[PDB]
Amino acid sequence: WTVDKGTGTSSVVEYLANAGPKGTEGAMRVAPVSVGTNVSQVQAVTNPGMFSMSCMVNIATTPGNAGQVSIGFLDAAGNSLPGGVSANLGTTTGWQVIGKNTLRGKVPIGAKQVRVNIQTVAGADVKYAYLLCNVVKP
Amino acid sequence: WTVDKGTGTSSVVEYLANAGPKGTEGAMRVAPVSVGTNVSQVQAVTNPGMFSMSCMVNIATTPGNAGQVSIGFLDAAGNSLPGGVSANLGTTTGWQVIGKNTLRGKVPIGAKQVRVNIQTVAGADVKYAYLLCNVVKP
């Protein structure tokens, strides 16, 4: 996972053992300060395809929308393509599922890469687990 | 194939025509000096998957165990993952099959690349042929 805290120098992004939904699995806690932190991963993908992702998110505290989880597609040169999807985390506390009707779609024509990004706003304390994406091809 | 002789500048790694098991195919001869020579190749692979590999090896001379053939898995970021396997070449001379109950397993989740390494110890002279690995999946 690529952790970009930006200028948010003291932002806390940490692995926590036994902190997931069941208490037996790992979790990633992101607590940005002043400015937001983005955690991302990029992998190879090809058209045609269909995808759906689910996430386990536990927002402890937030000053508003806690952030967003996004899926983007890139061509061979790294340029963004149409077909991106995003799910806002909201403000409701407790372990919850993201995102049933949001993080889904078709693999865009020309896509070489798929990138997931987890954005947590400044002032939010959120734990993430089970970042599961599946891409099914014909 | 990537030939890494390490500190052994005098190590001999050569292609030999008509030197394989049948006398009609190519073979690679490795005769390392001072330190062992490692020949490797990396290719992309991802979960889900299962794999098995076989090798044809002819040990001409060896001081001890002639070396090993290994398969390892790496993610996109270059981290080594569990599920690696290795097969020792032993001391028996003549064309023989390596990897039957050793170079096999499941592709670990998160794996983005698979790397084979052929290791020949210093002072050993062995020929390799038919380095056939299969990952069953489309």
Closest Cα in chain B to A42: B76
Contact yes or no for B121/B47 (Cβ under 8 A): no
Q: Which of A39, A40, A43, A134 to mutate to test the interface with B (most CBs of B within 10 A)?
A: A43
CA atoms of A74 and A42, how far apart (whole Å)? 9
The CA angle A35-A42-A47, to the nearest 5 degrees, is 135
Which chain A residues touch B44 with a CB distance below 8 Å? Answer: 44
On chain B, the residues whose CB falls within 8 A of the CB of A44 are 44, 112
- Cα gap B79→B38, rounded to integer Å: 20
DSSP category for residue A108:
P
H or E segment and range at residue A68: strand A67-74
Residue of B nearest to A133 (CA): B110
Residues of chain B contacting residue A42, judged by C-beta atoms under 8 Å apart = 76
**Shortest Cα distance, chain A CAs vs residue B45, angstroms:** 11
The resolution in Å comes to 2.2
Q: How many CB pairs under 8 A join A and B?
A: 6
- Residue given tokens 């270059």 in the structure block: B78
Strands of the sheet with A37-44, listed across from one edge = A2-4, A37-44, A113-120, A67-74, A85-88
Residues recorded for chain B: 138
Output Rg (C-alpha) for chain B, integer angstroms: 15
Rg of chain A taking only CA atoms, in angstroms: 15
Give the separation between CA B136 and CA B49, rounded to whole angstroms.
6
Q: Do B44 and A44 touch (CB under 8 A)?
A: yes
Query: Could you report how far apart the first and last alpha carbons of chain B are, in Å?
Result: 24
Interatomic CA distance for residues B79 and B41, integer angstroms: 16
Contacts of A74 in chain B (CB under 8 A): none
Residues 6+ apart with CB under 8 A from A22: none
Q: How far apart are CA A102 and CA B131, in angstroms?
A: 46
For residue A31, give both structure tokens: 């607590």
The residue in chain A having the minimum alpha-carbon distance to the alpha carbon of residue B138 is A137
Q: How far apart are CA A39 and CA A25, in angstroms?
A: 19
Identify which of B114, B46, B123, B124 has the alpha carbon closest to the alpha carbon of residue B89: B124
Please name the residues in contact with A6: beta carbons below 8 A apart, sequence gap of 6 or more.
A35, A36, A37, A38
Nearest alpha-carbon partner for B101 in B116, B85, B119: B85
Burial class (CB in 10 A: 0-12, 13-18, 19+), A99: buried
Report the phi/psi class of residue A94: left, alpha or beta, with left for phi > 0 and alpha for psi in -120 to 50. left
Find tokens 């599961």 and name the residue: A132
Q: For A45, which residue in chain B has the nearest alpha carbon?
A: B46
Q: How far apart are CA B57 and CA B36, in angstroms?
A: 16
Nearest to B109 by CA among B51, B48, B52: B48
Residues of B in contact with A112 (CB under 8 A): none
Q: Cα(A27)–Cα(A59) distance, rounded to whole angstroms?
A: 12
Instruction: Tell which residue, B42, B45, B43, has the closest CA to residue B138.
Output: B45
State the method: X-ray
C-alpha triplet A105, A108, A109: angle, nearest 5°:
150
Within its chain, how far is the Cα of A48 from the centroid?
23
Instruction: Return the bridge partners of B104, or none.
Output: B52
Give how far B29 is from chain A: nearest CA, Å: 36
Which tokens hold the place of B52? 């098995």
